[PDB]
Amino acid sequence: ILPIRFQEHLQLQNLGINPANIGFSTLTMESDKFICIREKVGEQAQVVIIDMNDPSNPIRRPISADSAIMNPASKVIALKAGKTLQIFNIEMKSKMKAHTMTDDVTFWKWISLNTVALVTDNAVYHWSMEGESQPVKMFDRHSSLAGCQIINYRTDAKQKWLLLTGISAQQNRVVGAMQLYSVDRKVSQPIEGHAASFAQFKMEGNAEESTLFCFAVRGQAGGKLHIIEVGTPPTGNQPFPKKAVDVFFPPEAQNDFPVAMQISEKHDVVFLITKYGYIHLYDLETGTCIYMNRISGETIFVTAPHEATAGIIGVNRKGQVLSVCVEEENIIPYITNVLQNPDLALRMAVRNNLAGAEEL
């Protein structure tokens, strides 16, 4: 028995997608609802829009953009060409918004249902789709990310804790550089890190949720995962006790590192995927490593939460669209009998309302 369930949703090559376009710069998956792929067929640049609820009928539309990112919930698409940003409602055949930046945008992403984050060489901006809003600067980039490839940007639910991640080569390894910014304190902290996520977690005995920051890093000394509360606990709350645990890489994976993290608040588990195809599952509360295995041959370069299973969905370089989630019938007996951790088993059974801890 395994504590996780793997599912293949699609092979993009079966829909006519050229594998040269299956990569970080040309394929975006901002949520589990859509995949957008920029392709050039003949003279014309196009975007192929895969609706994940109707995936055998992808729609191809001409574009003149260097990047396209679909809204997480709606057929509203953001496109850019150098400094020109445009937002379309596709069903309404409508240009919702147009904005001309004064810097090129190196990385952008939807950070919520109605806000796009824009990263330039020098700063990070948020742009709300509500009313007549324009981009607002959130913070200046820290010099520790200068020259990095920007690979992610995430926030907590209230958009008060902001996290920018870049990577570069130093001493012959991929080194991650993060910038954590507090909107309320107006302070940045540079952190060595590869992949991260925020999560809301209500501790037993607390009236209010804690906001947790979780990050994984392969440092010079080895792999580590941290789970730490950000900010002052809400009044009345006990503080969340911070956790730090090892992240294992086997001897043959000397050059592997973390590339993606998603946290299930249904099960309070952390999914971590590495560059070279390994999946790890950690308990959010303790950081206990529940499971590790190799699940892709190919590098997985983009992920999103998988809403239906409260798991993680991802696309690999072959064009396989794959999800991983907690196997709700197996996770508790796995932790009891294979990990031999009846304490964790019992806790998770009761915490997340899972069957199996009736015998320990």
Partner: peptide, 9 residues
Amino acid sequence: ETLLDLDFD
């Protein structure tokens, strides 16, 4: 300048 062509059917 229009980055997406939606007149195309």
